[PDB]
Design a protein around this ligand. Sequence first.
Ligand SMILES: [Cl-]
Ligand SMILES: [Cl-]
Ligand SMILES: [Cl-]
Ligand SMILES: [Cl-]
Ligand SMILES: [Cl-]
Ligand SMILES: [Cl-]
Lengths: 151, 150, 152, 153, 154
Amino acid sequence: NPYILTPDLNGEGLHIGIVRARFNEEIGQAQLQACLEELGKLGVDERDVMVVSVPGALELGVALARMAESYEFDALIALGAVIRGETYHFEVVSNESAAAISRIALETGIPVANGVLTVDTDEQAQARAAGKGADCAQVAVEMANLAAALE
Amino acid sequence: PYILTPDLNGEGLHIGIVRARFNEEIGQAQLQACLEELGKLGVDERDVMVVSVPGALELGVALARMAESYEFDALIALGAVIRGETYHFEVVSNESAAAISRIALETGIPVANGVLTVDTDEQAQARAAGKGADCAQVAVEMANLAAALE
Amino acid sequence: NPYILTPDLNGEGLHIGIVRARFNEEIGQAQLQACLEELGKLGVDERDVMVVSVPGALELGVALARMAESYEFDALIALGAVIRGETYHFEVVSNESAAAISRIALETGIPVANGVLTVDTDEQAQARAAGKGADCAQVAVEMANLAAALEP
Amino acid sequence: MNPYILTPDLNGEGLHIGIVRARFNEEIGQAQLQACLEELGKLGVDERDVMVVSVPGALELGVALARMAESYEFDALIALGAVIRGETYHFEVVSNESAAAISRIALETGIPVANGVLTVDTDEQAQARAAGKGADCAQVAVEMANLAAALEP
Amino acid sequence: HMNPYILTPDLNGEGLHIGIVRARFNEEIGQAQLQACLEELGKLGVDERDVMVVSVPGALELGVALARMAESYEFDALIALGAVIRGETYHFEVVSNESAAAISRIALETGIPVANGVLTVDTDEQAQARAAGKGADCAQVAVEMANLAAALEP
Ligand SMILES: [Cl-]
Ligand SMILES: [Cl-]
Ligand SMILES: [Cl-]
Ligand SMILES: [Cl-]
Ligand SMILES: [Cl-]
Ligand SMILES: [Cl-]
């Protein structure tokens, strides 16, 4: 019987930062609403959440990095959609955006929820946008509280 | 040629566990097999900590904070990445493994990679218990191997 | 209604650095013309923009890095085209050039627009050159302003 | 042109070599190591200057080589083992990460690390390459250890 | 319109110090590259007394050599030569990826341009067709980029 930390989905008093990659506009918009309502449903106050926008997923890294450095946020959320087109640009954007999100969380200690879809079709992104947005709100809240522990 | 001999001895070691809950049943089977093997090696139930994160992408931040505290001789990563419909499988598989590798290299804390990267739920089920036990065997040996080399 | 920062596409007073990988020259030149024209439309002064060129995408990293380190530029732009040929060289050039662009922006804090095409055919590069050049101007301007809001 | 051309130096005399062996695929690793030590001695390395360690798998090579490199007790390091494709993407994960760690350690500490980890599709391919790969890693470690010493001061 | 400052390429090797590392595996290919590379370097004005040439067994060993040479800051630019030719195993992908990543990483961290002259092809026949051209190209890249770094050092 080992000491088992229980997940804490209690947004009360957490400061959450959100960055939305706008490309595939309709997809990003659906994610954000599902994310914000779940944040409020989880206990996050509208006054403790900031939302910013970037043209595309490759620009997420520089934005999320600056917010992590401010240390004003307990956790961050990355939103957006990369939809396969005709070229190897899909694999590049998918790899680099995911790696940057991963790297920021590791070096600054600020959890970053990876809500960036990497899909083949608009239909796949539409089916996942709202659900993944809600999941990203849950991941940010739990991982922010998990970060406060272990400190 | 001096040949360091393997040392499989939990014996009072503090081992940290992070479990990605996605594909929950798989993670629980790994954790059950993992703790059982840890005790079989001599790790005290009060000296091993277990933490949970939603998915494999959240392992990096959890394992990282635990490693920096230097409270643990070795770490264990558990969870399962099962191929679905999208390139998300390759992303989660690559980044989760890269973080586990990176935390071990930079911090000196060995991290057993118990994250399955499989194509089907059936493959994860066939391997869950075996890989959980192996991560206990790797975590114990690598914690001890660090001491002979520190 | 959470505080929602709105995009700022106002180039006025911004200093932009541009690095153009010349291999597949016609594509790089089309991107540069579309990029500069869009920069001016956003309010960037022609006297505040520097343009340098390198033989290929693998040489972008070292040039962009020195420009970022000088901290003379609010944002940087990488232009060029990697077109699949006969060998794994395509995957190597595409991966490493993109990875360096990401790493420079992450570590120095200066946004770098990734305008390097990674395509299979010359026709694909031609169809995308002008749009990607102009898009890189919009990304550089917007992200330079976005960085300023978080700098203090 | 007649530029100065540094010539390879394959004179192990007095070199201290560290070895880390991934035990998974047992027969492959020892066949590599026996071939490796035999070639090291043929190159002039004394048996008293070589240390040998074992790890469960290739993914644990990185942390072990890292502790040895940080000590700066070794002129060059060698990583041995075999990754044989099975049924899952695990083959690519182990192959990529283990090689990347070997690469990163050599760059950051300046201590060359010979990459002796095979990445093959079948046991038969691993067997065909095991013996040659042990010897090749000895020639790489000795030569690259001396090349670091030249470029040193 | 927009007529910004356009720094123009400088292909004048005169007074540049170039370091070269040649991965010997596939000997004939690497040597064909080196001769084409030295011949082009001299054509650009680089003195044979300002060029150093070193050797490594393979591309996986390029990184550690190039890194030590770059740290000395005795060289205005570096060149990596060699060939990785696909065989029977995933070793081709590993060697191609890691050697290229190290070459890229050294240029970023030290500021010393490193020309990637490592071919990554499927057949010896492709390597033969490219050896001389890439050797000459790495001479032009090293010279031009050495001068471009100097223009940005101020
Ligand atoms: Cl950072
Ligand atoms: Cl807009
Ligand atoms: Cl940098
Ligand atoms: Cl290190
Ligand atoms: Cl030219
Ligand atoms: Cl370095």
